[PDB]
Ligand binder design. Structure first.
Ligand SMILES: [Zn+2]
Lengths: 16, 151
């Protein structure tokens, strides 16, 4: 199988 | 916006990965020797150290790396898959105590996430929760030094 990326976290809370 | 932490999943479980120094690291107990998905096909692991319970793939798209800690602080902060920050007091080379124990459920799915210092720099990679009757009071982590060394 493969590891897929389901989401991401920005530690600074950057909205941009 | 680029993220330092990736929320990943395999057919069986969900956990986290953390990009440190251009590499996307996570726990071997979550990924194994699995490859990581990309739009050009799966990319194989750059590093694999079953002993340290560590694996590493090239940093993926939409990510940014974390800077290893160099201040040596013992006041750590664990980031969960839900983006919750949990203060941890470092007890040793690879362990720290939660300043406020949480039920194990609160820490589930977070292995592979980062243990940060007061400067938000990477101190280690969350390896496993140390529970006592369903309450997580401490955690085991892989020092960034091991990652630096693996590279
Ligand atoms: Zn630091």
């Amino acid at each position: 199988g493969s590891v897929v990326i389901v989401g991401r976290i920005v530690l600074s809370g950057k909205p941009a | 916006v680029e993220g330092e932490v990736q929320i990943v999943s395999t057919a069986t479980q969900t956990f986290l990965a953390t990009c440190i120094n251009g590499v996307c690291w996570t726990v071997y107990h979550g990924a194994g020797t699995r490859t990581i998905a990309s739009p050009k096909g799966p990319v194989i692991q750059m590093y694999t150290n079953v002993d340290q319970d560590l694996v590493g793939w090239p940093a993926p798209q939409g990510s940014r790396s974390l800077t290893p800690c160099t201040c040596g602080s013992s006041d750590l902060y664990l980031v969960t898959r839900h983006a919750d920050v949990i203060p941890v007091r470092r007890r040793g080379d690879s362990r720290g105590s939660l300043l406020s124990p949480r039920p194990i459920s609160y820490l589930k799915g977070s292995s592979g996430g980062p243990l940060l210092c007061p400067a938000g720099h990477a101190v280690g990679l969350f390896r496993a929760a140390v529970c006592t009757r369903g309450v997580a009071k401490a955690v085991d982590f892989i020092p960034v030094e091991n990652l630096e060394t693996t590279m």
